[PDB]
Design a protein around this ligand. Structure first.
Ligand code: NA
Length: 508
C-alpha cells in the first residue's frame, strides 16, 4: 500500500562463486519500493545519492542534485570498495543502479539515473518510486584471489539536497572460492622436493638425524576455511603408524623415522596414514607469492598457513649405504558448502649410513688397551697373549684389510737399544706393515645370527728374545702393537693400540 521513505538495512550474500568461471549478473534489489503515497504527491521526486562522488568506501556515484529539470535517462555507475575478510586487500567493483517512477493512472517504466529529477507521465506527477541495483556480469573476475569479499553500499534517500529521508545500507558479501588453486606449496621446491635426514653416528652403532621441509597450505580462499584435513602417508604400506626408508640396494632392510608438523603455532605428530583434522581458528598465517596450479591466474601474494615438517631419526646398527622413501602429503581444506577435493605433494626422503668397522672380543667386550706377557725364567720364553675376536661391521660384503701401523718392539724402559721383536697374528695370519686381506666370504658372517658380526678369529701377541737360543736381557720392557683394520673401497678403518709389557728379573 502506502509507504513512507526511511532508512533501511539490507544484506546480500553472493555465491559461493568459483574464480574458475566468469561471474553472472547478480541482482541486489529489483524494483524495491522506496516510497508511495496514493492521496498526495509527496514522493514524486525521490532521489538516491552516494555519500561521495569519488570516495569509494561506501560507493562513489553522483552525490549531489542533477543540473536541470531534464531527467537523466539510463543507469548510474557506482564504484564500490570490496575488502577481503582475512587479508584486508581492497578492490573496487562496479555496481549498477536505477530508479523508476510509479503513477496512479498510467505506466512509464523508464529507467532513470539515481539523482534524476522528476518527469510527468501523460501529464500526471509521480506517486512514488522503486530502486534497482545489480552487479554486472564479469565483475567478480576482477577480484585478485579467493576469499570472503565484503562491501557496504550506502545511499542517502533524498528529494533534493536539503531534504533527507534516511539512508540505505546494503551489506554485500561475496564468497569467492578458487578450488583449482588449492595446493600444498613448498617455498624451496617448485617441483621434485627432497630431504636428507643427515644421519650422523653418535656411537655404539646409533645414528641420529634431523631435517625439515617448509610448506604452506593454501585453500584458494584466503584462509577462510574453518578446518584442514592433512595426511602424511608413506609408500611402505604395512599397517602401523611408522615411516620407513628402504635401503636402495636391499629392500629387505629399513630405517625408521618420525614426523612432526610445526604448523603456524600448533604442534602435531603425524603417524603413517592417519589424517589430522585441524581447526584453523587458532592458526597464524603468512603472505606468500603462490602462483596458479593451472587457471585462473593469481597475480598477487595470497594468505596461506605456514608449516615446517620436521623429520627425526634415531636408529641402531643400520646396514651401510643409501636409503630412500617417499612421503605423500594430502590436504583437503574444509568447504562445508560442497564437496571440496583433495590435493597432494610428494617428498623424496633419503639418508646415508656411513660404513663402519670395529674389532671386539667374541664376548662383545672391548679389546684391552694393555697386555703383559708372562715370563718364565725356566724356559726363558714369554707366554703369548691370545684372544678370540670378532669384527663388527655394518658393511659385511666388503674385504677386511688388516695390518700393523709399525713393526712393534718390546723396548727396555731404561735402554732404547735393548729390544725384543713382538709378533702379532690374527685370524690365523701373521701380520706386518704389509696388509693382508680377508674376503668377507671367509670371515663366516651370519645371515641367520646378527648382521655384520664375524665368526671368531684368534688374536695372538707374542714376543721372544731377539737372538734365538739366548736369554732376554734383564729389565722392564714396553712396546705398542697398533692393529689397523680397514674395509674395502669404503675408506674407513679402526685402530686398536695395545700397550704390551714384560719384565725379566736378574739371575741373582
Ligand atoms: Na492526480
Amino acid at each position: 500500500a502506502d509507504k513512507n521513505p526511511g532508512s533501511e538495512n539490507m544484506t546480500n550474500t553472493i555465491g559461493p562463486h568459483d574464480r574458475g568461471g566468469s561471474s553472472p549478473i547478480y541482482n541486489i534489489l529489483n524494483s524495491y519500493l522506496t516510497a508511495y503515497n496514493g492521496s498526495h504527491h509527496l514522493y514524486d521526486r525521490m532521489s538516491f545519492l552516494c555519500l561521495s562522488s569519488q570516495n569509494t568506501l561506501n560507493g562513489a556515484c553522483p552525490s549531489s542534485d542533477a543540473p536541470g529539470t531534464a531527467t537523466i535517462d539510463g543507469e548510474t555507475n557506482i564504484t564500490l570498495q570490496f575488502t577481503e575478510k582475512r587479508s584486508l586487500i581492497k578492490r573496487e567493483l562496479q555496481i549498477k543502479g536505477y530508479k523508476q517512477f510509479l503513477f496512479k493512472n498510467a505506466n512509464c517504466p523508464s529507467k532513470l539515473a539515481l539523482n534524476s529529477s522528476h518527469f510527468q507521465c501523460n501529464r500526471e506527477q509521480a506517486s512514488g518510486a522503486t530502486l534497482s541495483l545489480y552487479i554486472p556480469a564479469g565483475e567478480l573476475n576482477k577480484l585478485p584471489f579467493g576469499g570472503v569479499w565484503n562491501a557496504v553500499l550506502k545511499l542517502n534517500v533524498k528529494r533534493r539536497y536539503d531534504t533527507t529521508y534516511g539512508t540505505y545500507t546494503i551489506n554485500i558479501t561475496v564468497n569467492l572460492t578458487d578450488k583449482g588453486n588449492i595446493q600444498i606449496w613448498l617455498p624451496q621446491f617448485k617441483s621434485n622436493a627432497r630431504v636428507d635426514l643427515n644421519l650422523r653416528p653418535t656411537g655404539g652403532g646409533t645414528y641420529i638425524g634431523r631435517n625439515s621441509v617448509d610448506m604452506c597450505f593454501y585453500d584458494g580462499y584466503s584462509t577462510n576455511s574453518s578446518s584442514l584435513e592433512i595426511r602424511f602417508q608413506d609408500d611402505n604400506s604395512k599397517s602401523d603408524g611408522k615411516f620407513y626408508l628402504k635401503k636402495i640396494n636391499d629392500d629387505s632392510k629399513e630405517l625408521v623415522y618420525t614426523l612432526s608438523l610445526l604448523l603456524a603455532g600448533k604442534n602435531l605428530t603425524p603417524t603413517n596414514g592417519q589424517a589430522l583434522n585441524i581447526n584453523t581458528a587458532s592458526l597464524e598465517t603468512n603472505w606468500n607469492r603462490i602462483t596458479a596450479v593451472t587457471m585462473p591466474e593469481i597475480s598477487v601474494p595470497v594468505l596461506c598457513w605456514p608449516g615446517r615438517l620436521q623429520l627425526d631419526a634415531k636408529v641402531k646398527n643400520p646396514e651401510a649405504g643409501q636409503y630412500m622413501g617417499n612421503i605423500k602429503i594430502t590436504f583437503t581444506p574444509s568447504s562445508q558448502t560442497l564437496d571440496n577435493k583433495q590435493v597432494e605433494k610428494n617428498i623424496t626422503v633419503t639418508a646415508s649410513v656411513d660404513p663402519v668397522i670395529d674389532l671386539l672380543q667374541a664376548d662383545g667386550n672391548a679389546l684391552p688397551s694393555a697386555v703383559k706377557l708372562a715370563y718364565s725364567p725356566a724356559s726363558k720364553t714369554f707366554e703369548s697373549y691370545r684372544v678370540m675376536t670378532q669384527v663388527h661391521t655394518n658393511d659385511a660384503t666388503k674385504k677386511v684389510i688388516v695390518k700393523l701401523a709399525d713393526t712393534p718392539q718390546l723396548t727396555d724402559v731404561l735402554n732404547s737399544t735393548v729390544q725384543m721383536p713382538i709378533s702379532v697374528s690374527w685370524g690365523g695370519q701373521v701380520l706386518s706393515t704389509t696388509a693382508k686381506e680377508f674376503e668377507a666370504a671367509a670371515l663366516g658372517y651370519s645371515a641367520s645370527g646378527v648382521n655384520g658380526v664375524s665368526s671368531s678369529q684368534e688374536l695372538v701377541i707374542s714376543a721372544a728374545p731377539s737372538t734365538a737360543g739366548t736369554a732376554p736381557t734383564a729389565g722392564n720392557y714396553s712396546g705398542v702393537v697398533s692393529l689397523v683394520m680397514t674395509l674395502g673401497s669404503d675408506n674407513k678403518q679402526v685402530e686398536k693400540n695395545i700397550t704390551v709389557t714384560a719384565s725379566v728379573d736378574p739371575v741373582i
